[PDB]
Amino acid sequence: LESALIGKPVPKFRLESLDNPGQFYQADVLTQGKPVLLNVWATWCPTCRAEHQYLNQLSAQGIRVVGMNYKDDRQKAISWLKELGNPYALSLFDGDGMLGLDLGVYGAPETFLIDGNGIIRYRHAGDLNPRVWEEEIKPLWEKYSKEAA
């Protein structure tokens, strides 16, 4: 849906790595110099499992995806990745959902497009499928990929 963050930088945060206990990340990790997709997901989200296989496909094509596990059960989340594959370059654990609150998410799943400079450029509330990618996000990803280059 619509977002008041379009054109604004990613909110400050300090979250623990989902699969690397003790390692914490900050917003600087979302300023890669290349565009990135931030995917909000959880194991309790039905369309998330279905969307996971498509994310694996995009990741294999070079699309950079950062995963934000939302108000979820950490262990179940880790098993989820070991069982279905890990498309994420990095996985953040938003156990309390505080980053989700600053991002204005309605729930899961949701995908944000962030440019190389850490500026939020698009927000899609709902599952990521070929149609959404081809019609809504792909054109934007290509634009910011060419500029970052």
UniProtKB/Swiss-Prot annotation:
Disulphide bridges: 45-48
Domain of life: Bacteria
Protein's job: Involved in disulfide bond formation. Catalyzes a late, reductive step in the assembly of periplasmic c-type cytochromes, probably the reduction of disulfide bonds of the apocytochrome c to allow covalent linkage with the heme. Possible subunit of a heme lyase. DsbE is maintained in a reduced state by DsbD.
Phenotype for residue 45 to S: Drastic decrease in activity
Membrane topology (UniProt): Single-pass membrane protein
Name used for this protein in its record: Thiol:disulfide interchange protein DsbE
Gene Ontology, cellular component aspect: outer membrane-bounded periplasmic space; plasma membrane
Chief location: membrane
Organism annotation: Escherichia coli (strain K12)
Family of this protein: Belongs to the thioredoxin family. DsbE subfamily.
Keywords: Cell inner membrane, Cell membrane, Cytochrome c-type biogenesis, Disulfide bond, Membrane, Redox-active center, Transmembrane, Transmembrane helix
Gene from which this protein is expressed: dsbE
